[PDB]
Amino acid sequence: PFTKHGQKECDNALRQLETVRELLENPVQPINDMSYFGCLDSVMENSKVLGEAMTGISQNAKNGNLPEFGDAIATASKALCGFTEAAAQAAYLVGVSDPNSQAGQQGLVEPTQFARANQAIQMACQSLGEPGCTQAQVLSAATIVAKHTSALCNSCRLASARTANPTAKRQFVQSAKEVANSTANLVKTIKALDGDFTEENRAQCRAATAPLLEAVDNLSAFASNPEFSSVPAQISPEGRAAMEPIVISAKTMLESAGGLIQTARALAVNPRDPPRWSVLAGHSRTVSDSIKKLITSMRDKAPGQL
Amino acid sequence: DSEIDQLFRIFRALGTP
């Protein structure tokens, strides 16, 4: 059961590495807010962390300290994800830096989290509309409503401030009021329901979901227009060539790190295995070499970002 | 009107990580 805990951390790490790998597939948008030297500082610090973690991975697999082994694996996985985000961000910056490249444009609204809120509010309201809805369900649905309506109104305020489209500016403000007003009206019915859980107050609360659903639905429809969505960067062939050394080095790091974790997973179960210790050393060196090439590639281009 | 805003803020706190 203790080794099973270590194996599970390995499987979690491997899952995260495959997820973060997608950042390197086609960097046509920024990953975060980091500048170029921000990315470089990030990779350097994650290098120190990863180096320490990889020492802990081997040492604790050998000595059979499975709790410390799992922690070293998780630490390594986090550093590798940090590496990849910085590398993918730096590669994007390099690609769009090219004179014949065009940078991406972030949308007025984060695309899916708007549908996420719409769905969460729809299903919260669905619960409030059910004849069998219990008092605890009113409370849980109310927390869902409050969380996502607050987010929706914040996104409306921000989207309105960013857009140059006058119609969109007014619509986002109008939708924010519609959501705020309908939500407040629903919260009013919920408070009355709490003080007196009558059939009238139950029907009143149920009825108050409809104006909220309509507002959130009209808003989701309007905000899903492609005009308001992000535009991917158009990176020139020269930009692609320039960013490729960073990309392939980060890709090679993730691949070799996967082998290292898979090998360590087996060694945690049975460390008495000289062949696998050699395989682990092979993966470790390839991880280290990949990082070296990544830092080298990024340092080569650093003077152009001073 | 203000008790509703207070209740709403309680609801948001209970449903936010």
From Swiss-Prot, chain A:
Annotated region (Helical bundle R7B) at 228-300
Q: What is this protein called?
A: Talin-1
N6-acetyllysine: modified positions:
191
**Domain commentary:** Consists of an N-terminal FERM domain linked via a short unstructured region to a large flexible C-terminal rod which contains 13 amphipathic helical bundles (R1-R13). The rod begins with a five-helix bundle (R1) followed by three four-helix bundles (R2-R4). These are followed by a series of eight five-helix bundles (R5-R7 and R9-R13) in which the N- and C-termini are positioned at opposite ends of the bundle, creating a linear chain. The four-helix bundle R8 does not disrupt the chain because it is inserted into a loop in the R7 five-helix bundle.
Quaternary structure, from the entry = Part of a complex composed of THSD1, PTK2/FAK1, TLN1 and VCL. Interacts with THSD1; this promotes interaction with PTK2/FAK1 and VCL. Interacts with NRAP and LAYN. Interacts with SYNM. Interacts with ITGB1; the interaction is prevented by competitive binding of ITGB1BP1. Binds with high affinity to VCL and with low affinity to integrins. Interacts with APBB1IP; this inhibits VCL binding. Interacts with PTK2/FAK1. Interacts with PIP5K1C. Interacts with F-actin. Interacts with SVEP1.
Q: Where is this region: Interaction with VCL and F-actin?
A: 6-306
Q: Where in the cell is it found?
A: Cell projection, Ruffle membrane; Cytoplasm, Cytoskeleton; Cell surface; Cell junction, Focal adhesion
Annotated region Helical bundle R7A: the residues are 6-100
Q: Where is this region: Helical bundle R8?
A: 108-227
Describe the function of this protein.
High molecular weight cytoskeletal protein concentrated at regions of cell-matrix and cell-cell contacts. Involved in connections of major cytoskeletal structures to the plasma membrane. With KANK1 co-organize the assembly of cortical microtubule stabilizing complexes (CMSCs) positioned to control microtubule-actin crosstalk at focal adhesions (FAs) rims.
Curated annotation (Swiss-Prot), chain B:
Q: What induces it?
A: Follows a cyclic expression; during interphase, accumulates gradually following G1, S to reach a critical threshold at the end of G2, which promotes self-activation and triggers onset of mitosis. Induced transiently by TGFB1 at an early phase of TGFB1-mediated apoptosis, but later repressed. Triggered by CKS1B during mitotic entry in breast cancer cells. Down-regulated under genotoxic stresses triggered by PKR/EIF2AK2-mediated phosphorylation.
Q: How is it modified after translation?
A: Phosphorylation by PKMYT1 and WEE1 takes place during mitosis to keep CDK1-cyclin-B complexes inactive until the end of G2. By the end of G2, PKMYT1 and WEE1 are inactivated, but CDC25A and CDC25B are activated.
User: Which locations, inside or outside the cell, does it occupy?
Assistant: Nucleus; Cytoplasm; Mitochondrion; Cytoplasm, Cytoskeleton, Microtubule organizing center, Centrosome
Q: Give TM regions.
A: none
PTM sites of type Phosphothreonine? 16
Additional information: As a key regulator of the cell cycle, CDK1 is a potent therapeutic target for inhibitors in cancer treatment.
As for family, the record states: Belongs to the protein kinase superfamily. CMGC Ser/Thr protein kinase family. CDC2/CDKX subfamily.
> What this chain does, per the record?
Plays a key role in the control of the eukaryotic cell cycle by modulating the centrosome cycle as well as mitotic onset; promotes G2-M transition via association with multiple interphase cyclins.
Subunit notes for this chain? Forms a stable but non-covalent complex with a regulatory subunit and with a cyclin. The cyclin subunit imparts substrate specificity to the complex. Interacts with cyclins-B (CCNB1, CCNB2 and CCNB3) to form a serine/threonine kinase holoenzyme complex also known as maturation promoting factor (MPF). Promotes G2-M transition when in complex with a cyclin-B. Can also form CDK1-cylin-D and CDK1-cyclin-E complexes that phosphorylate RB1 in vitro. Associates with cyclins-A and B1 during S-phase in regenerating hepatocytes. Interacts with DLGAP5. (Microbial infection) Interacts with severe fever with thrombocytopenia syndrome virus (SFTSV) NSs; this interaction is inclusion body dependent, it inhibits the formation and nuclear import of the cyclin B1-CDK1 complex and leads to cell cycle arrest.
Query: What name is this protein filed under?
Result: Cyclin-dependent kinase 1
Q: Which residues of the full protein are shown?
A: 207 to 223 of 297
